[PDB]
């Protein structure tokens, strides 16, 4: 239900050039082939961009103590400009990175029409494989089409969109 | 300055596990070298996940017909449920998938404290190379730490942060 509302909110303004789909895949026998067939099914439709499946690395965890959390808070109360400028963080860990099992795939769509139809397809794989797939939507603050050739398509879609209200 | 305010909004409520730093860069070998320096800086910090540099593919573009856009609007207006159930798209294209040469990287950070320090690190390399690297901040609806081991660290930070607000 949260996915339907989220996709609705993304489409509401007629623009989807700053949205994304993120999918995380656990390690599995079928996983890489799901990715292959999804990529293919997704891109029989125009305006869709799909990434390669990719890996990630991560550092060790760290818990911040109450005093550190508080001084971040005092710095927050000074607003965006002084949050950025006065932040400093010295914490080091003396260790290597861990290589994760989980694969990730990013999808984009140039217009709301493509976006709805892409999320519905992804949700279809996410439903049929519920143990191996996490599905989320992204709003990129001040984002645009990563593939710049789509820009006239989105701007034009928004144009016609706006005159219809 | 847009970046400062998006960072401030993502951290406003003591949750970064629903957030991401996204960066896009050109194929330049001189650029892949600066990315690696950046990853070295990033990984010496705790609570930071950094994906590999990854590539993307995409479909042909399509301009939607002012009349097709209308029928999508009639659905939008009936709401989040009806938009999802009723939407159909049977648009195809006669071409091949194209391979972009834009690379992409995604960075995660388990707490607002780690998120701010990672945007500040990533952003130095973006301003230093504004033609070859583009830097964004993302909000993932109902997101969690992609690496599960961080969940207790995020949940602790939030507990303390809500006590200290």
Curated annotation (Swiss-Prot), chains A, B:
Domain of life: Viruses
Subcellular location: Host nucleus
Subunit field text: Homodimer. Interacts with human UBE2I in the nucleus. Although this interaction does not promote IE2 sumoylation, it represses transactivation activity.
Function of the molecule: Transcriptional transactivator.
Domains as described in the record: The C-terminus is involved in dimerization, DNA binding, and transcription factor binding. The approximate tandem repeats seems of variable length depending on the isolate.
Protein name in UniProt: Immediate-early protein 2
Organism: Human herpesvirus 6A (strain Uganda-1102)
Gene name in the database record: U90/U87/U86
Full protein stretch here: 1286 to 1450 of 1452
